[PDB]
Design a protein around this nucleic acid. Structure first.
Ligand SMILES: [K+]
Ligand SMILES: [K+]
Ligand SMILES: [K+]
Ligand SMILES: [K+]
Ligand SMILES: [K+]
Ligand SMILES: [K+]
Ligand SMILES: [K+]
Ligand SMILES: [K+]
Ligand SMILES: [K+]
Ligand SMILES: [K+]
Ligand SMILES: [K+]
Ligand SMILES: [K+]
Ligand SMILES: [K+]
Ligand SMILES: [K+]
Ligand SMILES: [K+]
Ligand SMILES: [K+]
Ligand SMILES: [K+]
Ligand SMILES: [Mg+2]
Ligand SMILES: [Mg+2]
Ligand SMILES: [Mg+2]
Ligand SMILES: [Mg+2]
Ligand SMILES: [Mg+2]
Ligand SMILES: [Mg+2]
Ligand SMILES: [Mg+2]
Ligand SMILES: [Mg+2]
Ligand SMILES: [Mg+2]
Ligand SMILES: [Mg+2]
Ligand SMILES: [Mg+2]
Ligand SMILES: [Mg+2]
Ligand SMILES: [Mg+2]
Ligand SMILES: [Mg+2]
Ligand SMILES: [Mg+2]
Ligand SMILES: [Mg+2]
Ligand SMILES: [Mg+2]
Ligand SMILES: [Mg+2]
Ligand SMILES: [Mg+2]
Ligand SMILES: [Mg+2]
Ligand SMILES: [Mg+2]
Ligand SMILES: [Mg+2]
Ligand SMILES: [Mg+2]
Ligand SMILES: [Mg+2]
Ligand SMILES: [Mg+2]
Ligand SMILES: [Mg+2]
Ligand SMILES: [Mg+2]
Ligand SMILES: [Mg+2]
Ligand SMILES: [Mg+2]
Ligand SMILES: [Mg+2]
Ligand SMILES: [Mg+2]
Ligand SMILES: [Mg+2]
Ligand SMILES: [Mg+2]
Ligand SMILES: [Mg+2]
Ligand SMILES: [Mg+2]
Ligand SMILES: [Mg+2]
Ligand SMILES: [Mg+2]
Ligand SMILES: [Mg+2]
Ligand SMILES: [Mg+2]
Ligand SMILES: [Mg+2]
Ligand SMILES: [Mg+2]
Ligand SMILES: [Mg+2]
Ligand SMILES: [Mg+2]
Ligand SMILES: [Mg+2]
Ligand SMILES: [Mg+2]
Ligand SMILES: [Mg+2]
Ligand SMILES: [Mg+2]
Ligand SMILES: [Mg+2]
Ligand SMILES: [Mg+2]
Ligand SMILES: [Mg+2]
Ligand SMILES: [Mg+2]
Ligand SMILES: [Mg+2]
Ligand SMILES: [Mg+2]
Ligand SMILES: [Mg+2]
Ligand SMILES: [Mg+2]
Ligand SMILES: [Mg+2]
Ligand SMILES: [Mg+2]
Ligand SMILES: [Mg+2]
Ligand SMILES: [Mg+2]
Ligand SMILES: [Mg+2]
Ligand SMILES: [Mg+2]
Ligand SMILES: [Mg+2]
Ligand SMILES: [Mg+2]
Lengths: 271, 93, 45
RNA sequence: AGGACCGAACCGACUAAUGUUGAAAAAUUAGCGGAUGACUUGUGGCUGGGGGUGAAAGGCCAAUCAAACCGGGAGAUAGCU
RNA sequence: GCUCGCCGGAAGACCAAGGGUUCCUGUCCAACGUUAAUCGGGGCAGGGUGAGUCGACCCCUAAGGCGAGGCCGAAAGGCGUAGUCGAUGGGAAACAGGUUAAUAUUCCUGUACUUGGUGUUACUGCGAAGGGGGGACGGAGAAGGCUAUGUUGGCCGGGCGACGGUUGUCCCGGUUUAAGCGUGUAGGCUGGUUUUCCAGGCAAAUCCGGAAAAUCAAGGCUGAGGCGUGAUGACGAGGCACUACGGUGCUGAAGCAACAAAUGCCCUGCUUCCAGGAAAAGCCUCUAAGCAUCAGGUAACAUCAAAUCGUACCCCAAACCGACACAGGUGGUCAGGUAGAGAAUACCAAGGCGCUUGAGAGAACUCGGGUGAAGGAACUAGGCAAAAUGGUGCCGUAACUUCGGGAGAAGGCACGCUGAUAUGUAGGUGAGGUCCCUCGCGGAUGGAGCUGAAAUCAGUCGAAGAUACCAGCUGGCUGCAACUGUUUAUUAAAAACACAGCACUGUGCAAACACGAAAGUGGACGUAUACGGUGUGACGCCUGCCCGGUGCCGGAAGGUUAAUU
């Protein structure tokens, strides 16, 4: 549910929270946890390579099963959990053989729901099949780009792909971007949409809430000196140049895709 | 077991002082200057062999040498090892 | 006021010690220069 | 509950006087702001000079910064004093 | 030596870091010490640091470093796998008392504990580089149970007062005791046990995970404190006796209770929230290959071992960082009394100090302060500075508002002491005694004793009762920026930067983008509800016209046009 905070202080006035009572209040399932220490957006040369990353809360990594290749064995959803590593919630599932895994939580999935993967799974939310076996027009998520590689498309909260067509070895997918893309029909997908669609209705409300998520401040190019940025300089607020990145590339319309290897799979660009 | 050659080099001198004299009279403890690399086991063995007494326990410390001016030039005395060797009750060295 | 030299023997040795000098060609050239000059103290060690 | 309130520690540095061959190459005294947070602090680590880092002042990078320091090219060149 | 003054959440005490003999004793006073110096952190000499249990080393890992092969790179080198290092984190064990001129959880006394090796006896499936468990973790908040600790009484020892009074409802002091071992309480968590079965835990598993029946209802785990023992001991006010008057010797009473009480402990708990909270080993358990009446395991018993290095001293400072015996800087720990909300503040305790030139004088002027007739901002760029306000309870409080605020708006009244209500109340605490008992550190009951606000009524002193220290000035109009934040270390704190929010735009994942001759790495173990870039800057009402110029996006007929031929 989407809840507006009362304005008891100026940092609370604009806060809008997504409060989900279904999520597990206790600790996560420890065998599927790993450490993931933070980068500050620095690479192995120690240089900042992505600006505006640093701080925020410590987070354990949950090993999520994006492959969904434990075929033919039913699993029951034990509980939904908060995952700090992503926008979607996750579901702890227990297979009949006693194995537990985490999956991305689809819309509508709750504790006690049964799921299954493989060629002969039912066409039901949370079930994973090769897209050869999924009806055309179906809504899916967690879509593989190569067979066996694990889901890479439509993983964020509320996202999904539509299977628009099937043509021999390939299916045509409408992605959330609006792009029409071909993928091999042997690639798996999970039926339904990713859950937590209310994610986008949150309002952080204050500077500190972005800092908790490990986002450091953006400084505008025009606020700098010429030495620091193409936009820098001026006595007062001045501009008078075409907008560019800090490295001088036009940043309002200039296309940057350059991948002749994957062009063959793109039926229609998002536009 | 330690070789006799080794035991004949570990004990360097008796240490003479008010604290050493008091240690002997009150606690039956002899204070020795010993080789810098001497262990408690070697000191015990050497005392029992060479002084012909029975040793209860050895405590050791390293004394750091003093920095000293000779004329103008600065020098430093050597570090050395001190052993407090407690003898058994009725030994009487 | 807090001045620039804030001593730490661990940081001193890791930054400038003999083994830090020996770890790179350029550090070994420091030692070569200092031996050639005839320094009594080659490093902070 | 809170980048909530008053207020010590702690972190700052708005005003004034003093000091200006200082007690101090930036402080003292009286007042002043924050004080559960985008807080503060210990230890260790990483980023290196047209390079870093910068909630951006050309700020900071060892009392040095519109290009650090050390050594070298080197006795640069100086129609100037 | 006596007195005086100063600090006392420190200007006391103990450390880390850093320093390195500055420590203690004797001796010296040239130089050093902002003066003299018989003194010193100064000179010279001698002494002084004692560990199975404290720490390091050590076992284990974090960030990160290095990195056999490897991948990459004119060379130098870069990155990185297996590994191997790396604490600021995890991992066995000791306490009280005594003692030196100078060390002490290290020496001594008393009483303990840990790990491992060897052997002796008994019983016995042991075995890892593998599996599982555990270690193992956040913020805030709340309350109960405690202890440290304090206060008072009792007890014991001493006192009878330099000046009115002081044999008491009087004065002073003491009233301390550990780890360990035993016990298992307030509290916290969890249903047990058995059997059968199984696509999971790289193989196996009796372990973990899963499934299904049978059965019973209390089993297990965790846990402060208390109590017992430790302790017929130790310590002990003082008394007595010496002194080489520095200090020792000798001996030693009481050693209880009630109440108050932490920020410490139960508590790595409980409740709650979103921003969702290390790792690895030690440890427990499972088996594989293997060994198979052998080794090995398990417990008791005995015996041996536990090395090495640090340990002095300073440590908010005259010993460290600041050229100085420098108003500076420097992380952790301890936390007494009266008043107080308090770690504020005032005065004190323990303890520590008077800051290494003094002596006079009592001009101008400067510095830091006190008071001021009448006036009261006339000062001045500007109320700069100063003066003022200042506490608690209660009454009361406007425009405007995003309904939270504005607000402590504003403004006002009470406030000490004594007595009574009540020889001390409401409340808190809770003994003896009685009652019951699935039997204890137990309930039910009872209110002895202890502690104890707040109010009312009456009285009473002063000019003044929030008496000191401490401790908001308030209100009206308006520019800018929504707000909390950030900034020019050292003349600018702001209207600048950031900000949540908004928009445009790029980006289909080997993403765009960035660092990198490269390998790679970040972006992200993310995937368009995502990520980068740009501008704008909460919120409200909104955001008009222009595509000619420059850019970007799309087009692709025609003109022009490179190497090449
Ligand atoms: K910005
Ligand atoms: K500009
Ligand atoms: K710069
Ligand atoms: K500008
Ligand atoms: K400017
Ligand atoms: K440069
Ligand atoms: K003098
Ligand atoms: K040791
Ligand atoms: K060692
Ligand atoms: K009297
Ligand atoms: K103990
Ligand atoms: K006890
Ligand atoms: K010591
Ligand atoms: K220290
Ligand atoms: K204003
Ligand atoms: K300011
Ligand atoms: K145009
Ligand atoms: Mg960004
Ligand atoms: Mg999430
Ligand atoms: Mg994240
Ligand atoms: Mg932004
Ligand atoms: Mg600027
Ligand atoms: Mg430029
Ligand atoms: Mg202008
Ligand atoms: Mg213009
Ligand atoms: Mg001993
Ligand atoms: Mg030792
Ligand atoms: Mg606040
Ligand atoms: Mg600052
Ligand atoms: Mg001040
Ligand atoms: Mg404020
Ligand atoms: Mg405050
Ligand atoms: Mg400028
Ligand atoms: Mg500087
Ligand atoms: Mg230049
Ligand atoms: Mg030349
Ligand atoms: Mg010249
Ligand atoms: Mg000396
Ligand atoms: Mg001395
Ligand atoms: Mg003198
Ligand atoms: Mg003289
Ligand atoms: Mg001296
Ligand atoms: Mg230890
Ligand atoms: Mg590593
Ligand atoms: Mg490497
Ligand atoms: Mg190699
Ligand atoms: Mg290691
Ligand atoms: Mg450590
Ligand atoms: Mg001492
Ligand atoms: Mg917590
Ligand atoms: Mg008590
Ligand atoms: Mg009497
Ligand atoms: Mg009298
Ligand atoms: Mg008394
Ligand atoms: Mg606190
Ligand atoms: Mg000491
Ligand atoms: Mg002085
Ligand atoms: Mg000082
Ligand atoms: Mg401090
Ligand atoms: Mg106090
Ligand atoms: Mg104070
Ligand atoms: Mg005067
Ligand atoms: Mg004056
Ligand atoms: Mg005055
Ligand atoms: Mg007047
Ligand atoms: Mg008067
Ligand atoms: Mg008057
Ligand atoms: Mg007036
Ligand atoms: Mg006026
Ligand atoms: Mg005027
Ligand atoms: Mg005038
Ligand atoms: Mg003023
Ligand atoms: Mg004033
Ligand atoms: Mg105006
Ligand atoms: Mg502002
Ligand atoms: Mg502010
Ligand atoms: Mg400035
Ligand atoms: Mg300023
Ligand atoms: Mg990549
Ligand atoms: Mg702006």
């Amino acid at each position: 549910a989407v809840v507006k905070c009362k304005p008891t202080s100026p940092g609370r006035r604009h806060v809008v929270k997504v409060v989900n009572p279904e999520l597990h209040k206790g600790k996560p399932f420890a065998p599927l946890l790993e450490k993931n220490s933070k980068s500050g957006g620095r690479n192995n040369n120690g240089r900042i390579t992505t600006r505006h990353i640093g701080g925020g809360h410590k987070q354990a990594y949950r090993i999520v099963d994006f492959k969904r290749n434990k075929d033919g064995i039913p699993a029951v959803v034990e509980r939904l959990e908060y995952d700090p590593n992503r926008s979607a919630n996750i579901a702890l599932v227990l297979y009949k053989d006693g194995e537990r895994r985490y999956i991305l939580a689809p819309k509508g999935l709750k504790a006690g729901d049964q799921i299954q993967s493989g060629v002969d799974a039912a066409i039901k939310p949370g079930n994973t099949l090769p897209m050869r076996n999924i009806p055309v027009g179906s809504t899916v998520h967690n879509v593989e780009m190569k067979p066996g590689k694990g889901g890479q498309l439509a993983r964020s909260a509320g996202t999904y792909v539509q299977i628009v067509a099937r043509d021999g070895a390939y299916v045509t997918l409408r992605l959330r971007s609006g792009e029409m893309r071909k993928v091999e029909a042997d690639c798996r997908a999970t039926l339904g949409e990713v859950g937590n669609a209310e994610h986008m209705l949150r309002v952080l409300g204050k500077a500190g809430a972005a800092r908790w998520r490990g986002v450091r401040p953006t400084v505008r190019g025009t606020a700098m000196n010429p030495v620091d940025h193409p936009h820098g300089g001026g006595e007062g607020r001045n501009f008078g140049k075409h907008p560019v990145t800090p490295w001088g590339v036009q940043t309002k319309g200039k296309k940057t895709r350059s991948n002749k290897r994957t062009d063959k799979f793109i039926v229609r660009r998002r536009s | 077991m330690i070789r006799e050659e080794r035991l004949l080099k570990v004990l360097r001198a008796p240490h003479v002082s008010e604290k050493a004299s008091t240690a002997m009279e009150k606690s039956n403890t002899i204070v020795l200057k010993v080789a810098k690399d001497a262990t408690k086991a070697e000191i015990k063995a050497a005392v029992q062999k060479l002084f012909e007494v029975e040793v209860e326990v050895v405590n050791t410390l390293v004394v750091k040498g003093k920095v000293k001016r000779h004329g103008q030039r600065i020098g430093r005395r050597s570090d050395w090892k001190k052993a407090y060797v407690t003898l058994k009750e009725g030994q009487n060295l | 006021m807090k001045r620039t030299f804030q001593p730490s023997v661990l940081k001193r040795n890791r930054s400038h010690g003999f083994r830090a000098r020996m770890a790179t060609k350029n550090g070994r050239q420091v030692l070569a220069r200092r031996r050639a000059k005839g320094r009594a103290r080659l490093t902070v060690s």
